[PDB]
Enzyme design. Structure first.
Site, mmCIF file in Angstrom:
data_model
loop_
_atom_site.group_PDB
_atom_site.id
_atom_site.type_symbol
_atom_site.label_atom_id
_atom_site.label_comp_id
_atom_site.label_asym_id
_atom_site.label_seq_id
_atom_site.Cartn_x
_atom_site.Cartn_y
_atom_site.Cartn_z
ATOM 1 N N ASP A 177 0.816 -1.215 0.000
ATOM 2 C CA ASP A 177 0.000 0.000 0.000
ATOM 3 C C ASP A 177 0.854 1.271 0.000
ATOM 4 O OD1 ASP A 177 -2.525 1.129 -0.342
ATOM 5 O OD2 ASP A 177 -3.059 1.083 1.782
ATOM 6 N N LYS A 197 2.002 4.763 -0.840
ATOM 7 C CA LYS A 197 1.416 5.958 -1.447
ATOM 8 C C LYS A 197 1.574 7.112 -0.459
ATOM 9 C CE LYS A 197 -3.280 4.647 0.039
ATOM 10 N NZ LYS A 197 -4.705 4.526 -0.395
ATOM 11 N N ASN A 238 -0.039 7.385 3.081
ATOM 12 C CA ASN A 238 0.341 6.418 4.105
ATOM 13 C C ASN A 238 1.708 6.698 4.722
ATOM 14 O OD1 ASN A 238 -2.106 5.109 3.917
ATOM 15 N ND2 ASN A 238 -1.319 3.353 2.732
ATOM 16 N N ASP A 285 -0.589 2.233 8.112
ATOM 17 C CA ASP A 285 -1.547 1.433 7.346
ATOM 18 C C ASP A 285 -0.972 0.138 6.779
ATOM 19 O OD1 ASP A 285 -4.496 2.488 5.490
ATOM 20 O OD2 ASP A 285 -3.897 0.484 6.174
ATOM 21 N N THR A 310 -4.021 0.720 -4.419
ATOM 22 C CA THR A 310 -4.623 1.883 -5.057
ATOM 23 C C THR A 310 -4.262 1.893 -6.533
ATOM 24 O OG1 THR A 310 -4.347 3.072 -2.971
ATOM 25 C CG2 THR A 310 -4.731 4.392 -4.961
HETATM 26 N N1 LIG Z 1 -3.179 7.008 6.153
HETATM 27 C C1 LIG Z 1 -3.931 7.791 7.142
HETATM 28 C C2 LIG Z 1 -5.085 6.988 7.748
HETATM 29 O O1 LIG Z 1 -4.641 6.548 9.043
HETATM 30 C C3 LIG Z 1 -3.761 7.566 9.587
HETATM 31 C C4 LIG Z 1 -2.801 6.884 10.592
HETATM 32 N N2 LIG Z 1 -1.910 7.786 11.347
HETATM 33 C C5 LIG Z 1 -1.175 7.062 12.405
HETATM 34 C C6 LIG Z 1 -0.206 7.935 13.226
HETATM 35 O O2 LIG Z 1 -0.668 9.261 13.538
HETATM 36 C C7 LIG Z 1 -1.505 9.903 12.559
HETATM 37 C C8 LIG Z 1 -2.551 9.010 11.877
HETATM 38 C C9 LIG Z 1 -3.078 8.180 8.360
HETATM 39 O O3 LIG Z 1 -3.116 9.611 8.471
#
Ligand SMILES: N[C@H]1CO[C@@H](CN2CCOCC2)[C@@H]1O
Length: 339
Positions: free
Chosen positions: A155, A157, A160, A173, A190
């Protein structure tokens, strides 16, 4: 390098011990206060939370069990939690707690307040080659680590890749990550980032991550991805053609690296040849990269995100705030026994 071999040998030993005895049930929902929704998807959300007893902030990923079953994501959600609890690398987000209740699965990970690479790339326009190279080097090292553990990420991109307080990447992710010895077959990812062998329904391997790195480097340096269109079927037609146009501002070294990462024949793609990751590490585009200094986090980052403190959400965007419901009755208990 013997120091590299010994590092990866110990890395695999440590991963396997956690892989074979996964942790479970290390917190519960009423240990946290809910602050803000940071992202929303078809079966889950990510919310900024504060642990009541310690005051620490965390990013809590909440998955609705019934929606995971309907969208056929059971195995993927079990992969994600099992892999995240077992890995350990400087550029991977850390899982701190996990648990489940009558309705949901929960993965509580470190909160990275600097926001997604995607936002900064769109705000700046494009990254200079040194800036893109700094991020790319971290991805190369992260894939070297994951692949040595027989993991495929699937994944990559900009949304992420989170930017931390030092300007370094934290990969998030793991929803599509899988332990694979040999090939795997699932259609996931994606569209803009899919390798040709995924689009063509072949058995595929870690080479798909190296293709995705080519897409990411192109997008960082140009400001837009190499294959795009209104409809996914049109995107797929461009991908399976061995055709890519480079902006004139790209250096000759960058174009050469990208031709070898965006190689449609997976048997000729950099990262998947006899010399593995070293064909990438030794490429001319990386000639200025001190690989050890990057791993040790000793290189000054090209930029540091602006934020006020560990609970600041200004680098994330606004979503409708919805309830976190927990049904009075247990849902899908059998399906998620191992979680
Ligand atoms: N790909 C996006 C969706 O999940 C979020 C995970 N993070 C983990 C650590 O702190 C901020 C949020 C990402 O912004």
């Amino acid at each position: 390098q013997e120091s590299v071999k010994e590092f990866l040998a110990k890395a695999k030993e440590e991963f396997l011990k956690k892989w074979e005895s996964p942790s479970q049930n290390t917190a519960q929902l009423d240990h946290f206060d809910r602050i803000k929704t940071l992202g929303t998807g078809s079966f889950g959300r990510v919310m900024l939370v504060k642990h009541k007893e310690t005051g620490n902030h965390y990013a809590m990923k909440i998955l609705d069990k019934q929606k995971v079953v309907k969208l056929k994501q059971i195995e993927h959600t079990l992969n994600e939690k099992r892999i995240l609890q077992a890995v350990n690398f400087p550029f991977l987000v850390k899982l701190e707690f996990s648990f489940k209740d009558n309705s949901n699965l929960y993965m509580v990970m470190e909160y990275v307040p600097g926001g997604e690479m995607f936002s900064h790339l769109r705000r700046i326009g494009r990254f200079s080659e040194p800036h893109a190279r700094f991020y790319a080097a971290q991805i190369v090292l992260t894939f070297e680590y994951l692949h040595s553990l027989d993991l495929i990420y699937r994944d990559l991109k900009p949304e992420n890749l989170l930017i931390d307080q030092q300007g370094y990447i934290q990969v998030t992710d793991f929803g599509f990550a899988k332990r694979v010895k040999g090939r795997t077959w699932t259609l996931c990812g994606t569209p803009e980032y899919l390798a040709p062998e995924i689009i063509l329904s072949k058995g595929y391997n870690k080479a798909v991550d190296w293709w995705a790195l080519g897409v990411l480097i192109y997008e960082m340096a140009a400001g837009y991805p190499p294959f795009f269109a209104d409809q996914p079927i049109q995107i797929y037609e461009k991908i399976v053609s061995g055709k890519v146009r480079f902006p004139s501002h790209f250096s000759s070294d960058l174009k050469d690296l990208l031709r070898n990462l965006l190689q449609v024949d997976l048997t000729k793609r950099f990262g998947n040849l006899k010399n593995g990751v070293n064909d990438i590490k030794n490429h001319k585009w990386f000639a200025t990269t001190d690989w050890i200094a990057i791993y040790q986090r000793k290189v000054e980052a090209p930029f540091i995100p602006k934020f006020k403190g560990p609970g600041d959400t200004s680098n994330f965007d606004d979503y409708e705030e919805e309830e976190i419901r927990v049904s009075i009755n247990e849902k899908c208990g059998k399906e998620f026994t191992e979680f």
